[PDB]
Design a protein around this motif. Structure first.
Motif, mmCIF file in Angstrom:
data_model
loop_
_atom_site.group_PDB
_atom_site.id
_atom_site.type_symbol
_atom_site.label_atom_id
_atom_site.label_comp_id
_atom_site.label_asym_id
_atom_site.label_seq_id
_atom_site.Cartn_x
_atom_site.Cartn_y
_atom_site.Cartn_z
ATOM 1 N N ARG A 245 25.544 43.416 42.676
ATOM 2 C CA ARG A 245 26.758 43.921 43.306
ATOM 3 C C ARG A 245 26.806 43.567 44.784
ATOM 4 O O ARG A 245 27.883 43.316 45.335
ATOM 5 N N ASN A 285 46.613 40.352 34.442
ATOM 6 C CA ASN A 285 46.341 40.133 35.852
ATOM 7 C C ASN A 285 44.848 39.909 36.031
ATOM 8 O O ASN A 285 44.033 40.334 35.211
ATOM 9 N N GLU A 287 42.959 40.957 38.614
ATOM 10 C CA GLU A 287 42.550 41.762 39.757
ATOM 11 C C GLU A 287 41.239 42.491 39.504
ATOM 12 O O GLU A 287 40.657 43.056 40.435
ATOM 13 N N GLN A 499 40.574 43.347 30.288
ATOM 14 C CA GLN A 499 39.887 42.775 31.440
ATOM 15 C C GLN A 499 39.023 41.591 31.033
ATOM 16 O O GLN A 499 39.031 40.548 31.696
ATOM 17 N N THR B 360 40.263 54.300 40.641
ATOM 18 C CA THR B 360 39.861 53.474 39.511
ATOM 19 C C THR B 360 41.020 53.336 38.532
ATOM 20 O O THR B 360 41.531 54.333 38.013
ATOM 21 N N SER B 361 41.446 52.101 38.298
ATOM 22 C CA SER B 361 42.580 51.817 37.428
ATOM 23 C C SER B 361 42.641 50.313 37.200
ATOM 24 O O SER B 361 41.791 49.555 37.677
ATOM 25 N N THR B 362 43.663 49.888 36.461
ATOM 26 C CA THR B 362 43.935 48.479 36.226
ATOM 27 C C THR B 362 45.193 48.010 36.942
ATOM 28 O O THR B 362 45.647 46.885 36.706
ATOM 29 N N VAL B 363 45.769 48.838 37.808
ATOM 30 C CA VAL B 363 46.964 48.427 38.551
ATOM 31 C C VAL B 363 46.598 47.307 39.517
ATOM 32 O O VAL B 363 45.605 47.428 40.260
ATOM 33 N N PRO B 364 47.345 46.208 39.552
ATOM 34 C CA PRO B 364 47.016 45.125 40.481
ATOM 35 C C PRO B 364 47.354 45.479 41.921
ATOM 36 O O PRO B 364 48.182 46.349 42.199
ATOM 37 N N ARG B 365 46.691 44.780 42.843
ATOM 38 C CA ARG B 365 46.883 44.975 44.273
ATOM 39 C C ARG B 365 47.578 43.757 44.858
ATOM 40 O O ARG B 365 47.055 42.640 44.727
ATOM 41 N N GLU B 549 34.654 51.289 43.477
ATOM 42 C CA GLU B 549 35.053 49.987 43.998
ATOM 43 C C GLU B 549 33.884 49.035 43.822
ATOM 44 O O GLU B 549 32.787 49.297 44.326
ATOM 45 N N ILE B 979 55.372 39.190 37.924
ATOM 46 C CA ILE B 979 55.950 37.898 37.568
ATOM 47 C C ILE B 979 56.986 37.439 38.577
ATOM 48 O O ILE B 979 57.365 36.259 38.566
ATOM 49 N N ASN C 28 39.704 54.546 33.279
ATOM 50 C CA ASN C 28 40.919 54.173 33.981
ATOM 51 C C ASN C 28 42.075 55.067 33.554
ATOM 52 O O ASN C 28 42.150 55.505 32.403
ATOM 53 N N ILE C 29 42.965 55.356 34.503
ATOM 54 C CA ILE C 29 44.130 56.186 34.229
ATOM 55 C C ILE C 29 45.027 55.487 33.212
ATOM 56 O O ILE C 29 44.946 54.267 33.013
#
Lengths: 794, 1125, 50, 50
Positions: A245, A285, A287, A499, B360-365, B549, B979, C28-29
């Motif tokens: 990490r 995505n 990310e 993912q 903590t999530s999968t939402v993009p930044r 993170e 998109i 994750n949420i």
């Protein structure tokens, strides 16, 4: 009411700071210290060496008046004081005279012989014997052997120079010499051991000049080999994960837009016609690529921490699930996934190509215990002449980077299906031919869609150099013995299907910008912080009997204190955070047990552990030099022993046989008045408890009437110091009889006296010389600028 | 060297004369030294000076701080300048019209209209006329339109203007609200004559009485007309409410203040007598007798209007403020820490746990180039820092034809937010985001009600950029908008808020259901209150981002060269900056430890803290309730099951449900227990709760300015366009005036006002307003112009634009729409006036910075620049430089268009038929039946007919299926992220459609890598938007709803059922969204008349022509592809 | 007697337990993990009597 | 849990007894479990809908 937030520092900064200084490789010159003597002479051919207190510390045990504890406390504290003066020093410097056409090199190391004329009032006859003493103290040279079997067996040259002083001085100096020169070695052996340890010929060590071969250097008590790292296995997984990490700061993924455009050109269907494979990858995505890359690298290193996929389905399927499973099957190698994940994705694939079997029944019948056989038989069915679906695989790479390290390395899998050429690797065959289409509760996939999917999942073929440099720096910096460590924290090996599919679609690979030296320095820091605690336990706590493996949990708080204190010593921060973050999976008890096992296996405790034990005997032998005595005697009408009147005119020394002794002080102190008078009436009374006594030697010119022995305030209370007074008999006045007036005119009816006393008498002036050892820097000089590799030649 | 701190006595300036005792110079020692009683003697304050000066003669350090203090000279000031400066930052005067027109127009020509209905209003004119006659001359309103801002200039009196403001707003409020009861308009008149004498200080003096009057206002009642709803599941946030019936009930609402009735009665009576004692002896006995009438009302008939009307009178004076220094002094004093470290540890752990579960999530930044252009879009008042070296206005402007035409050029700079995208070069690269005692400028805002001064703390651009990236993943989940039983539920940050039924469904339900109670406690200055716990909550914020993170700290200080984790160490490190604002007689700076204001996370921090202490208060309230239960009081079997806490920034609510509803006194006991628990458990560390400040109680809940009693919504309105602040409506165009003139009044009628009298009064100034200036050319528009924007006088408050326009052929109305079009649409020439790069280049690395993947290279996707160069991937920033600067020259493009609009009527221009009516749309075979004819509606303040419409169709839901093209495409755009290309928003789509018709829009975007289906769908949405109404910069930006049209369920759910099923092919979307919109408008109008349509055929002889269009249209789209032109 | 002699109780607060639960379980949420939701709604002020 | 009969000697007048530990922990810190430890299970909790 005010707080200031502290910004944390990066791992590399801490590692660099830990290696800045505070290292025990380079030594320095030093000289012996002189202790006060105050010798005198009563008459002809007799000389007295009065013992003088040399360390005022020490404190009485108020409980049980234990005798062993007092001596141990005194010795330990005095040793800790002495060891702070020879931290990185060896005794080499001493005061010589010359060696020039006269007698050979003579020494003047103790107090000058000239001052003895005034200090001892020598006559004309004995003065003639001083020049021969000065001219007869020649210097002798000899050799000694240092180094154990693990290190080399070197030889050094030592001197042995006479000096004038007390025998106690000689024994103290001998003890210091023994303590200071443990674990010594020469450069010419360190170099040989180092080239033996580094087997790489590409690295060559600086050659030693002929004048540096016999130089002397200090080495570590025990080397750190694979054995120490092998006992790390119960917790090695956390260290590996955090190391990965901390040094994988980025990922080289191609952007998703280019992959979409590449897919669009390959599909034969019309732009207006809707197709599910195209519409499914659009909801992705990149990310979360860094996290998945780190997890994949960890799975590549340890073969037990296989990636476990977490799926969002229970019974039914969805269009995105099928395409993501196909991407995983065709992109992610099978050596990096657990058996359950392989079986799950294989069943998802097989549910559509099968003529009769479905998804729900194919999962409800099979059991997770024996999924490996099901995976194998399904894979074989997909490699027949009816169906041919390639399965991504990988191989082992043994490439090693040239760097200085102490531990062996091994083979790891690669986190990508490449085999050092742009072409990928598949287990069965590189062709995609199927008997029919794919259909499972709808969601038909056309024949050529799979062929199109294979043409896009190919590695870019350009980033190979960057794709391999990171693997280079990662293979040759992790010890091989950790590769069998188990998994202690499940969340480090769990990823979601989307993912992983996104990671495999873009063909990402781990990347880094650091060098190889930093990681090996971090590993060395880990080893050092474990060895520090190991030797602390081996030198303080290690004890077989007396509360071993069966004790109340109450006692554990006492034991944990030392380890906690050591884990906060400005340079052990890497282990401390790992401990305080993952307590719930690896509790303190097993860590402490593992450290006990590590210390008990084999570890040099310390040079000081034997030093204190050796010094305790000296403390026992001579009480006067350490400012304490035991068994004082209280009496009235005392008598002298007539055996020390030859040295002192009048002394506090008596020879009465005691009677009805008291156990210890504070009992005589509070007993009662006119009740202790009966005790002294019957005869002498002795008090056993040790005291802090200071002696005062005076001549026959004045008096020092401290005499604070007994204070009468409705009792007879003893004091706490009990200073005594002697008077010296000298050649100036030795035929004169002192009236013995001032001794009793200042004391009281009850007198306090001392039973035993130790002094050393000498008959010849020749017996006033002793010996000490040195290093002889002329032939075995101290080393500087330790061994280094060659680089920046100019 | 000295400054004045004044609190309570004169915190707001009052009506004083500049000539009675101006006292040119005065000694300040007369008052008192704030810090120390001992150091106050002025003689010692001078003998010390003498001694120190004599010492200095010999030679001394003479510290300037200690020396100059002892000089008696320093305490000198001139009162006139101080008062003028205090007035010129305190009271704002922009409005819409100058008052000299409103003064005579509503009091000396139209006065007969006003008096003939309400005779009680003669007293206001009596007072005004006597005030003018008695003194004279001093009354002053010389307006200074020097550049574009009206600034009043006081002479005889400082608050003379506000006096007139209040006198006019009184008659304005009395006339528009149709009170149909005696003694209530009376008590309004007495309150008005009390606020008459002191226009600002009196507002705060009577604010206490008015708010405590609004507190109970309904306790002593006899009927209430309960409104019944379906059971509502408090747990699911997405749950909606449907109305079901009524029931009449005599049970008074069991709110609070029944326990503290005397404590509030005495307090309000003391406030009133304090106001009266300084006033003109208004017979306090009448006031004390009449104020008790307000709580003897009932929720039947036309009494619901009274609560709404009372609040309007509270904001009679407009937009006053308070001194900034005084407020910053006392708000930092009323905070106490005394408490335990255990509570601090609980707060820290709660905050850290709550951040970890959200990050903590999968939402993009989003990337930095995207986030930069998102910041410009934010245009935070704090964030904006426009800077332009020199934008020469060499524009040749036509001049007034007073005698001869003239052409002139005058330079002008800025006038709009300039993002300094040129300086982005430096911002993207070297820029360190750390704070070390630097100084920044501070701005202040004003509020209605004269409550106090609100301060905004702007932050530098790097901080705002870095902050947005760190919290993007927390902010998104919190503002999910669509969330279902998620852990996020607790946060309500994401709501429409524009309408109450959809935005806050829970409060209305909790107000009608008898098995639950609502806890609506409110706190003191929340932002300041955190100045003692900021070190802990910020630390928790910091280490909550270290875990969850994957990246680790590496220690970088340059933007873009940092990890997501790295930003946290640098940004959340406390040490706030210092802020410099301008005050009277000097400028002061301060340092605020706490949530601050412009910080890129203020709402998140506020809602995290608010939801934290609520749990700790509930924890101990449970213990206290259990204690009471074991003894004999609340009794057993009164135990709650589900408790839900909803937080929106500072404000928060608490709802608890029960199986058996506790009796009335049980509710009081438990509410008192809770309010006592919170004040020691959640108020010992600075927070302060008061039972008398919030509508705590049962059968009624009160959210942010929207409250509901017995199922009746009691909205607060209090919107005043006529006297707005921070505006230039007097120098606005006719288009902006006509857009504002129609929508604020619509909101006023919606939130409770009679439609007739309000619009009658508005029509009494349509000629007096809308007077454009065109260089010796004055217009005076009449009532006809309101038809063009889409308002029918004979109709309701409904946007009847299309239906009017089709019939706007024979009965005139074909002129005004063309007039507003020629007033607005010719600004498209301003859009077509693009400014090329010439004088400067700079690092110009920005164009390299922003890029989007392309299909037709850079020399294709439109052979001719007519639709190629203006939307170039390469030219992204070239385009947005001009598309971010319309206004700075649009204000003068309106001025030149003022010539063209006159020339249109001078010449034969205009008067031409529109283009909308050329296309033939209509239906056949329509079935029509009577409306329901029952009046139970949750909106009791509106007219009778609107209530009848609502019950027939029910409440609207989901706020999306109903078209409202203002927000439909915005929702589509929000759901379409990841998109979309870099530069995209509502403004870009609307302007692109306007510029390129229906061909070029599709042409440019079909080559910009977007799928066809959704682009076509939102193209249909945008053409529906453009046909719903015209341009209007105010309307297109942000947007404005049709209100009445959004609170009635006419969405596509039932609108699909109304249209009879067609047999042929599925119709295209270019015309379906048009004909169904026409059907929706038809449905809304006939219902006002009283009938409803339940069946409708498409008239397919017209549908085939519509299906023929695409036939040859898709062909044009594909044929131009077939050739590589 | 037990009530009169067991004066106090010792327990970690729920905030610490929620913190440790999230540390031990990274989810994750937008997945409906009802273990988190159910535990997130508890109070522990009734500890002396139990 | 298990029985526990360790006590501090002190002069008394009545009888003394053994009490169950309300604490699942043993005397040496190791947890006590009735059947088996290291929870592991080859299925997912499938309630009616949860």
């Amino acid at each position: 009411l005010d707080n200031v937030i502290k910004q944390i520092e990066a791992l590399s900064v801490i590692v660099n700071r830990s290696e800045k200084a505070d290292d025990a490789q380079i030594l320095g010159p030093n000289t012996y210290k002189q202790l006060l003597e105050h010798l005198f002479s009563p008459e002809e051919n007799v000389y007295i060496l009065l013992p003088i207190q040399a360390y005022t510390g020490g404190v009485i045990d108020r409980r049980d008046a234990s005798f062993s504890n007092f001596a141990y406390s005194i010795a330990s504290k005095l040793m800790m004081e002495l060891s702070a003066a020879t931290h990185n020093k060896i005794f080499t410097d001493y005061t010589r005279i010359a060696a020039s056409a006269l007698g050979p090199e003579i020494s003047t190391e103790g107090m000058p012989l000239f001052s003895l004329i005034e200090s001892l009032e020598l006559t004309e006859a004995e003065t003639s014997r001083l020049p021969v003493i000065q001219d007869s103290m020649v210097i002798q040279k000899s050799t000694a052997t240092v180094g154990n079997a693990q290190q080399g067996i070197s030889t050094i040259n030592i001197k042995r120079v006479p000096f004038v002083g007390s025998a106690f001085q000689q024994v103290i100096d001998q003890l210091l010499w023994e303590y200071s020169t443990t674990s010594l070695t020469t450069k010419e052996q360190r170099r040989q051991r180092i080239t033996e340890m580094v087997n790489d010929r590409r690295i060559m060590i600086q050659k030693l000049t002929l004048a540096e071969k016999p130089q002397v250097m200090r080495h570590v008590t025990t080397e750190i080999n694979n054995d120490l790292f092998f006992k790390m296995s119960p917790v090695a997984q956390l260290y590996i994960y955090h190391l990965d990490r901390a040094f994988l700061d980025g990922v080289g993924f191609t952007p998703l837009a280019e992959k979409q455009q590449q897919l669009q050109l390959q599909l034969k269907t019309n732009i207006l016609t809707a197709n599910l494979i195209r519409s499914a990858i659009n909801g992705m995505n990149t990310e979360s690529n860094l996290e998945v890359a780190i997890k994949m690298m960890q799975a590549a290193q340890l073969h037990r921490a296989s990636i476990e996929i977490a799926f969002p389905m229970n019974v039914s399927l969805s269009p995105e699930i099928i395409v993501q499973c196909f991407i995983v099957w065709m992109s992610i190698p099978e050596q990096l996934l657990s058996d359950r994940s392989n079986f799950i994705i294989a069943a998802v694939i097989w549910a559509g190509f099968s003529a009769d079997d479905s998804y729900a029944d194919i999962m409800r019948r099979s059991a997770r215990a024996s999924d490996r056989q099901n995976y194998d038989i399904i894979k074989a069915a997909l490699s027949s002449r009816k169906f041919k679906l390639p399965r991504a695989s990988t191989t082992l790479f043994d490439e090693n980077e040239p760097v200085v390290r102490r531990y062996q390395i091994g083979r790891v899998y690669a986190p990508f299906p490449v085999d050092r050429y742009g072409s990928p690797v598949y287990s069965n065959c590189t062709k995609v031919e199927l008997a029919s289409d794919y259909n499972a509760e709808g969601f038909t996939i056309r024949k050529d869609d799979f062929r199109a999917l294979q043409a896009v999942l190919r590695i870019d073929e350009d980033r190979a150099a960057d794709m391999f440099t990171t693997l280079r720096i990662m293979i040759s910096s992790i010890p091989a013995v950790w590769y069998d460590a188990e998994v202690v924290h499940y969340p480090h090996t769990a990823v979601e299907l989307e993912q992983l599919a996104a990671y495999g679609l873009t063909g990402a690979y781990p990347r880094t910008n650091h060098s190889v030296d930093t990681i090996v320095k971090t590993v060395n820091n880990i080893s050092a912080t474990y060895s520090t605690i190991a030797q602390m336990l081996s030198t303080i706590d290690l004890d077989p009997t007396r509360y071993g493996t069966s004790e109340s949990i109450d006692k554990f708080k006492i034991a944990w204190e030392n380890v906690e204190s050591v884990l906060n010593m400005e340079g052990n921060d890497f282990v401390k955070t790992i401990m305080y973050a993952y307590e719930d999976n690896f509790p303190k008890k097993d860590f402490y047990m593992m450290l006990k096992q590590i210390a008990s296996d084999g570890q040099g405790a310390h040079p000081i552990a034997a030093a204190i034990d050796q010094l305790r005997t000296i403390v026992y032998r001579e009480p006067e030099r350490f400012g304490y005595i035991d068994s004082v005697i209280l009496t009235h009408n005392p008598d002298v022993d007539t055996a020390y009147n030859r040295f002192f005119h009048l002394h506090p020394i008596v020879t009465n046989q005691p009677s009805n002794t008291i156990k210890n002080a504070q009992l005589w102190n509070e007993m009662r008045l006119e009740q202790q008078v009966e005790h002294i009436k019957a005869g002498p009374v002795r008090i056993i408890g040790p005291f802090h006594v200071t002696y005062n030697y005076l001549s026959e010119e004045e008096d020092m009437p401290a005499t604070s022995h007994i204070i009468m305030k409705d009792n007879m209370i003893l004091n706490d110091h009990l200073t005594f007074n002697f008077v010296k008999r000298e050649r100036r006045n030795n035929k004169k009889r002192v009236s013995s007036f001032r001794y009793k005119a200042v004391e009281m009816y009850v007198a306090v006296r001392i039973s035993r006393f130790q002094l050393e008498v000498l008959r010849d002036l020749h017996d006033l010389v002793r010996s000490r050892t040195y290093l002889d820097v002329s032939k075995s000089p101290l080393a500087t600028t330790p061994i280094r590799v060659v680089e920046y030649v100019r | 060297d000295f400054n004045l701190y004044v609190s309570g006595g004169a915190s707001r300036v009052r009506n004083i004369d500049m000539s009675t005792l101006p006292t040119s110079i005065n000694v300040l020692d007369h008052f008192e030294l704030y810090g120390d009683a001992s150091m106050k003697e002025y003689v010692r304050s001078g003998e010390w000076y003498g001694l120190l000066r004599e010492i200095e003669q010999e030679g001394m350090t003479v510290n300037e701080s200690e020396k100059v203090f002892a000089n008696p000279d320093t305490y000198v000031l001139n009162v006139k300048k101080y008062f003028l400066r205090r007035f010129q930052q305190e009271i704002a005067s922009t409005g819409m019209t100058p008052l000299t027109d409103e003064l005579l127009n509503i009091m000396f020509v139209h006065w007969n209209i006003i008096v003939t209905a309400e005779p009680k209003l003669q007293v206001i004119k009596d007072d005004l006329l006597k005030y003018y006659s008695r003194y004279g001359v001093d009354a002053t309103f010389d307006y200074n339109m020097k550049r574009s801002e009206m600034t009043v200039v006081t002479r005889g009196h400082l608050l003379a203007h506000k006096v007139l403001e209040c006198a006019l707003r009184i008659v304005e409020t009395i006339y528009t609200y149709d009170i149909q009861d005696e003694t209530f308009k009376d008590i309004l008149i007495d309150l008005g004559r009390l606020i008459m004498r002191d226009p600002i200080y009196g507002t705060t003096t009577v604010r206490d009485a008015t708010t405590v009057m609004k507190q109970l206002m309904y306790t002593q009642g006899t009927q209430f007309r309960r409104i019944m709803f379906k059971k509502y599941d408090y747990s699911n946030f997405n749950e909606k409410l449907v109305l079901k019936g009524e029931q009449m009930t005599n049970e008074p609402p069991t709110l609070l203040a029944t326990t503290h009735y005397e404590e509030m009665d005495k307090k309000r009576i003391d406030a009133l007598i304090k106001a009266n004692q300084r006033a003109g002896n208004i017979l306090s006995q009448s006031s004390i007798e009449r104020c008790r009438y307000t709580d003897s009302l009932d929720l039947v008939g036309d009494a619901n209007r009274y609560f709404s009307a009372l609040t309007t009178l509270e904001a009679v004076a407009g937009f006053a403020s308070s001194d900034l220094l005084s407020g910053f002094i006392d708000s930092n004093e009323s905070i106490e820490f005394t408490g335990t470290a255990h509570l601090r540890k609980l707060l820290y752990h709660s905050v850290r746990e709550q951040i970890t579960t959200l990050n903590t999530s999968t939402v993009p930044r989003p990337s930095l180039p995207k986030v930069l252009l998102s910041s410009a879009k934010d245009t935070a008042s704090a964030s904006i820092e426009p800077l332009t070296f020199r934008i020469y206005k060499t524009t040749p402007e036509y001049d007034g034809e007073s005698l001869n035409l003239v052409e002139s050029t005058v330079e002008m700079s800025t006038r709009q937010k300039k993002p300094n995208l040129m300086k982005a070069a430096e911002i993207l690269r070297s820029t360190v985001t750390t704070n070390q005692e630097m100084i920044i400028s501070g701005g202040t805002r004003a509020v209605q009600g004269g409550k106090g001064a609100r301060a905004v703390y702007p932050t530098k651009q790097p901080y705002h950029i870095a902050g947005s990236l760190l919290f993007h993943k927390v902010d998104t989940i919190v503002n999910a908008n669509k969330k279902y039983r998620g852990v996020s539920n607790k946060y309500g940050q994401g709501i429409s808020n524009a309408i109450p039924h959809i935005g806050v469904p829970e409060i209305i339900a909790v107000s009608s259901d008898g098995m639950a109670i609502c806890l609506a406690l409110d706190v003191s200055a929340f932002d300041v209150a955190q100045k003692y716990t900021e070190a802990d909550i910020e630390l928790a914020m910091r280490d909550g981002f270290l875990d969850s993170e994957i990246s680790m700290i590496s220690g970088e200080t340059v933007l873009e060269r940092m990890n997501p984790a790295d930003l946290a160490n640098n940004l959340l490190t406390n040490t706030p900056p210092r802020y410099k604002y301008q005050t009277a007689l000097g400028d002061i700076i301060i340092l605020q430890h706490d949530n601050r204001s412009g910080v890129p996370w203020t709402g998140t921090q506020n809602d995290l803290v608010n939801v934290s202490n609520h749990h700790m208060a509930y924890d101990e309230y449970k213990k206290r309730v259990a204690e009471l239960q074991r003894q004999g009081k609340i009794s057993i079997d009164v135990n709650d099951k589900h408790h839900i806490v909803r937080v929106f920034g500072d404000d928060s609510t608490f709802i608890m449900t029960y199986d058996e509803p506790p009796s009335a006194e049980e509710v009081h006991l438990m509410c008192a227990t809770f309010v006592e628990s919170y004040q020691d458990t959640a108020g010992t560390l600075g927070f302060a709760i008061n039972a008398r400040k919030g509508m705590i109680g049962r059968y009624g809940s009160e959210y942010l300015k929207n409250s509901a009693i017995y199922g009746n919504i009691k909205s607060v309105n209090q919107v005043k366009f006529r006297g707005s602040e921070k505006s230039a409506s007097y120098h606005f165009g006719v288009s902006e005036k006509v857009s504002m003139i129609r929508d604020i009044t619509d909101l006023t009628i919606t939130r409770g006002c009679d439609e007739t009298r309000k619009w009658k009064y508005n029509l009494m100034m349509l000629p007096v307003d809308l007077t454009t200036r065109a260089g010796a050319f004055r217009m005076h528009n009449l009532c006809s112009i309101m038809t063009g924007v889409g308002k029918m006088y004979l109709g309701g408050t409904l946007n009847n634009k299309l239906i009017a326009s089709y019939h706007g052929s024979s009965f005139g109305w074909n002129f005004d729409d063309n007039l507003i079009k020629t007033a607005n649409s010719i600004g498209a020439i301003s859009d077509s006036s693009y400014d090329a790069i010439s004088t400067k280049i700079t690092n110009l690395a920005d164009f390299k910075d922003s890029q989007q993947r392309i299909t037709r290279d850079i020399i294709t996707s439109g052979r001719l620049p007519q639709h190629l160069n203006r939307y170039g991937k390469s030219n992204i920033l070239r385009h947005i430089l001009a598309s971010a600067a319309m206004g700075p020259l649009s204000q003068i493009e309106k001025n030149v268009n003022a010539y063209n609009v006159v020339m249109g009527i001078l010449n034969g221009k205009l008067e031409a038929p529109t283009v909308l009516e050329r296309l033939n749309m209509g239906f056949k075979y329509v079935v029509m039946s009577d409306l329901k004819q029952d009046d139970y509606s949750p909106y009791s303040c509106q007219g009778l007919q609107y209530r009848r419409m609502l019950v027939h169709w029910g409440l609207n839901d989901s706020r999306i299926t109903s078209f409202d093209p203002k927000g439909k495409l915005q929702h589509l755009l929000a759901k379409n992220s990841q998109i979309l290309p870099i530069h995209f928003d509502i403004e870009f789509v609307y302007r692109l459609y306007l510029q390129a018709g229906t061909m070029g829009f599709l042409q440019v975007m079909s080559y910009y890598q977007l799928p066809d289906t959704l682009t076509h769908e939102m193209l249909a949405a945008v053409v529906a938007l453009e046909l719903q109404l015209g341009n209007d910069k105010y309307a297109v930006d942000m947007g404005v709803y049709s209100s009445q049209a959004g609170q009635i369920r006419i969405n596509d759910a039932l609108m699909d059922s109304i249209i009879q099923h067609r047999r042929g092919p599925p119709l295209p979307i270019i015309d379906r969204t048009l004909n169904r919109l026409l059907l929706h408008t038809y449905m809304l109008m006939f219902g006002l008349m009283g009938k409803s349509i339940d069946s409708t055929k498409i008239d397919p002889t017209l549908s085939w022509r519509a299906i023929l269009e695409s036939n040859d249209q898709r062909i044009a789209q594909l044929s131009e592809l077939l050739t590589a032109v």
